[PDB]
Amino acid sequence: TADNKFNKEQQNAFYEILHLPNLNEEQRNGFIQSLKDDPSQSANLLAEAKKLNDAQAPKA
């Protein structure tokens, strides 16, 4: 079945989203929970994360 096509960013991105030191992993692990369970739109979730981070990243 192969069906492989992770390069647009999912690869490097993945290993990245798994580090955002400003949020909890419950929610974060959530988006990616779909990356591993369903590596179809893993990239898109990544966008949703950096967003959840940039907002709650600073000490605000």
Distance, in Å, from the CA atom of 30 to the CA atom of 59, rounded to the nearest integer, reads: 23
Q: In this structure, what CATH number is given to the domain that contains residue 20?
A: 1.20.5.420
The two tokens of residue 47 are 């966008």
> CB count, 10 Å around CB of 23?
16
Structure determined by: NMR
Phi-psi region of 2 (alpha: psi -120 to 50; beta: other; left: phi over 0): left
For residue 20, the enclosing domain spans: 1-60
Cα of first residue to Cα of last residue in the chain, in angstroms, is 47
Structural domains counted in the chain:
1
| Cβ contact 49:28 at 8 Å | yes
